[PDB]
From Swiss-Prot:
EC number: 1.8.-.-
Domain Radical SAM core: 59-278
Annotated family: Belongs to the radical SAM superfamily. HydE family.
Native organism: Thermotoga maritima (strain ATCC 43589 / DSM 3109 / JCM 10099 / NBRC 100826 / MSB8)
Assembly and oligomerization: Monomer.
Cofactor(s) listed in the protein's UniProt record: [4Fe-4S] cluster; [2Fe-2S] cluster
Resulting phenotype, C77A: Eliminates binding of one iron-sulfur cluster
Effect listed in the UniProt record for changing C80A: Eliminates binding of one iron-sulfur cluster
Protein function: Required for the maturation of the [FeFe]-hydrogenase HydA. Catalyzes the reductive cleavage of S-adenosyl-L-methionine (in vitro), suggesting it may contribute to the biosynthesis of an essential sulfur-containing ligand that binds to the hydrogenase active site [2Fe-2S] cluster.
Annotated binding of [2Fe-2S] cluster, by residue: S321, S329, S332
Name assigned to this protein: [FeFe] hydrogenase maturase subunit HydE
InterPro entries reported in the protein's UniProt record: Aldolase_TIM, BATS_dom, Elp3/MiaA/NifB-like_rSAM, FeFe-hyd_HydE_rSAM, HydE/PylB-like, rSAM
Enzyme class: oxidoreductase
Domain of life: Bacteria
C-alpha cells in the first residue's frame, strides 16, 4: 500500500473553473465548487456567472413589485413565520380594491410586473384571485402569482384570467427533509404543481433555501441539478433565516457566501433564466441584493405591500423595514440599479431562449 495525498487547492479550483467554463456539470464538480472556501476561487466563480449574465440576459434589471396581500396560511411549514401555529402574529387580508389600487400605483411608479404573494389563504381561491388578475392585466403589465399549492383547476382559471408567471419555490429537493419541514405536503406535491404550471404555459419559478436544518452540500447539489433538469424560467434562491416564533428558532442561519455561490452556479447552469436578488439576501447582509446582482442575478422584487400590513408579513425577522414610507421601495431600487451601472427593464422581462 502507498500514500494518497490530496491535490493543491488553487490548481483544483482552477480545474473546477475550467470544467464550469466547458459546461461539464458533474455532481463532483458542483460539489467541489460549493465546498471550496477560497476567496479567490469564489470571486472567479462570481465573475464567470456575471459574464454569463451579461451575455445572455444583458444589463436590464427587471423590477417585479410584490404585494403580499394576506398573511393567512393553512399550512404549518416549520421555517415560516406565517405558519398557522404561530399565534403571536396579527393576521390580515387586503380587499380586492386595496390590492388593485395598490397595484395601479406600482404600475404608475414604473413596475412592469406585479407579483401577488400570500399565505395559502382559502378566502381568495380561486375566483377572487381571478378577478384581481383580470383587473391588473388591464394596466398593461405582467402578473406573477405566488400563492402556494392549489388544484390544477385553480391554476387553469388563473391562467385564463391572464396570469403570466407563477413562483413556487421548491424549497428543498430532498424529499425526506421536505416532508420534515413541510408536514402538510411533500416534494412530490410541490413538483406536481410546478409541472402543472409549466404544462399550462406559465413562466414557472422554483428555487431553494440555503442553510435549512439538516441540509448538506450534497442536498444543495441536488437542488442545482433539479433546477437544471427542469429549465425553470425563474429561480428564487435565498438563505434560510430562523424565525423566533417557529420550531426552527434556534437553528443556524443560512450562509450568505454559500447562497451567493448557489445563485452564481444557477446562472451558469441556466444562462437565460430570470434570477432575483431576493429579499432575504438583502436582509442578511447590508447591500446583499446589490452584491447578488453582480454575481448572476438580473431581477429585483421591491416590496410594495402597504402599511399597516407590510410589517405583518413576517416570513423571517428583519424582512421588513419600517423606517421609510411604503412607497419608497420602487424609487429606491431604481436608484440602486442606476448606481450599479445597470438599466431598468424596458419591457416585461419575460424569460427568453437565447442560449444554445
Ligand atoms: N424562514 C425563512 N427564511 C427564508 N425564506 C423563507 C422563510 N420562510 C419562508 N421563506 C420563503 O418565503 C417564500 C414565500 S412564502 C409565500 C408563498 C407561498 N405560501 C409558498 O409557500 O410558496 C417561500 O417559498 C420560502 O422560500
Ligand atoms: S412557506 Fe408559504 S405555505 Fe408554508 S407556512 Fe409560509 S406562507 Fe404558508
Ligand atoms: C423575492 N425577492
Ligand atoms: Cl416575476
Ligand atoms: Fe421573494
Amino acid at each position: 500500500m502507498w500514500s494518497h495525498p490530496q491535490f493543491e487547492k488553487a490548481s483544483t479550483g482552477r480545474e473546477i473553473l475550467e470544467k464550469l467554463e466547458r459546461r461539464e456539470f458533474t455532481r463532483e464538480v458542483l460539489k467541489e465548487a460549493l465546498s471550496i472556501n477560497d476567496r479567490g476561487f469564489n470571486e472567479a466563480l462570481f465573475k464567470l456567472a456575471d459574464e454569463i449574465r451579461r451575455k445572455y440576459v444583458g444589463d436590464e434589471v427587471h423590477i417585479r413589485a410584490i404585494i403580499e396581500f394576506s398573511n393567512v396560511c393553512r399550512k404549518n411549514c416549520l421555517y415560516c413565520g406565517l405558519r398557522r401555529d404561530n399565534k403571536n402574529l396579527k393576521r390580515y387580508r387586503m380587499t380586492p380594491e386595496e390590492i388593485v389600487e395598490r397595484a395601479r400605483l406600482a404600475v404608475q411608479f414604473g413596475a412592469k410586473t406585479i407579483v401577488l404573494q400570500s399565505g395559502e389563504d382559502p378566502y381568495y381561491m380561486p375566483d377572487v384571485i381571478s378577478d384581481i388578475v383580470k383587473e391588473i392585466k388591464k394596466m398593461g403589465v405582467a402578473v406573477t402569482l405566488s400563492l402556494g399549492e392549489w388544484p390544477r383547476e385553480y391554476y387553469e382559471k388563473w391562467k385564463e384570467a391572464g396570469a403570466d408567471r407563477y413562483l413556487l419555490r421548491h424549497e428543498t429537493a430532498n424529499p425526506v427533509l421536505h416532508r420534515k419541514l413541510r408536514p402538510d405536503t411533500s416534494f412530490e406535491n410541490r413538483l406536481n404543481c410546478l409541472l402543472t404550471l409549466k404544462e399550462l404555459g406559465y413562466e414557472t419559478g422554483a428555487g431553494s433555501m440555503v442553510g435549512l436544518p439538516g441540509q448538506t452540500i450534497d442536498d444543495l447539489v441536488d437542488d442545482l441539478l433539479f433546477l437544471k433538469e427542469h429549465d425553470f424560467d425563474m429561480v428564487g434562491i435565498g438563505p434560510f433565516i430562523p424565525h423566533p416564533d417557529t420550531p426552527l428558532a434556534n437553528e443556524k442561519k443560512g450562509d450568505f457566501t454559500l447562497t451567493l455561490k448557489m445563485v452564481a452556479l444557477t446562472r451558469i447552469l441556466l444562462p437565460d433564466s430570470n434570477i432575483p436578488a431576493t429579499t432575504a439576501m438583502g436582509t442578511i447582509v447590508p447591500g446583499g441584493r446589490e452584491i447578488t446582482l453582480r454575481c448572476g442575478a438580473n431581477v429585483i422584487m421591491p416590496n410594495w405591500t402597504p402599511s399597516p400590513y407590510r410589517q405583518l408579513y413576517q416570513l423571517y425577522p428583519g424582512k421588513i423595514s419600517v423606517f421609510e414610507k411604503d412607497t419608497a421601495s420602487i424609487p429606491s431600487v431604481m436608484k440602486m440599479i442606476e448606481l450599479l451601472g445597470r438599466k431598468p427593464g424596458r419591457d416585461w422581462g419575460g424569460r427568453k431562449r437565447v442560449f444554445t
